[PDB]
């Protein structure tokens, strides 16, 4: 089956944070968890990652935790918890970095981590089938529909979207060199 402790701890973290957003309001939690909006804040190191935990609607957190539990679960089960931790930490850091550049510091959501998992699971399952991981054609369809819809603003954090994807592809490429 699928139930890794990293998978579930991320799901719980996200839900705990989202409960807090509901009691305190978004901005209040945003003021503490969002990417540093002022260089003076730059040594508040949690912020480079914590933006990933914030969600701005129930639909967003469910949809994201679905993808996370599905693709995240698969990575933890087949490749270990350490691999899931690293993809998570790198993609959260890098998609937030790019996202801040694209449109400043007010954003959140696990969807950059998710696009990194999509990138990773797909390329890894392509170049390296024995990993026991793969992304289906229907889901890479929807992923592609999902990015470009963010371009055309019908998925708002585009730098996050494209950043995360890139990160997952690159790491899967690296990991698929090694066998």
């Amino acid at each position: 089956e699928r139930a890794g402790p990293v998978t579930w701890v991320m799901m719980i973290a996200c839900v705990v944070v989202f409960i807090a957003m509901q009691i305190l309001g978004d901005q209040e939690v945003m003021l503490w968890l969002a990417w540093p909006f002022d260089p003076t804040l730059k040594f508040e190191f949690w912020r480079y990652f914590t933006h990933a935990l914030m969600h701005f609607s129930l639909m967003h957190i469910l949809f994201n935790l679905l993808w996370w539990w599905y693709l995240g679960g698969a990575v933890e089960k087949r490749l270990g918890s350490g691999k899931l931790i690293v993809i998570t930490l790198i993609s959260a850091l890098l998609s937030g970095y790019v996202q801040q550049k694209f449109s400043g510091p007010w954003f959140g959501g696990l969807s950059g981590v998710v696009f990194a998992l999509m990138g990773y699971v797909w390329l890894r399952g392509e170049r390296d089938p024995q990993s026991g991981i793969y992304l289906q054609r229907g889901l890479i369809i929807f992923a592609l529909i999902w990015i470009v819809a963010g371009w055309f603003d019908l998925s708002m954090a585009n730098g996050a979207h494209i950043a995360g994807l890139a990160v997952g592809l690159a790491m899967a490429f690296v990991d698929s060199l090694n066998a």
Partner: peptide, 4 residues
């Protein structure tokens, strides 16, 4: 706010 943009949503990732």
């Amino acid at each position: 706010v943009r949503m990732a």
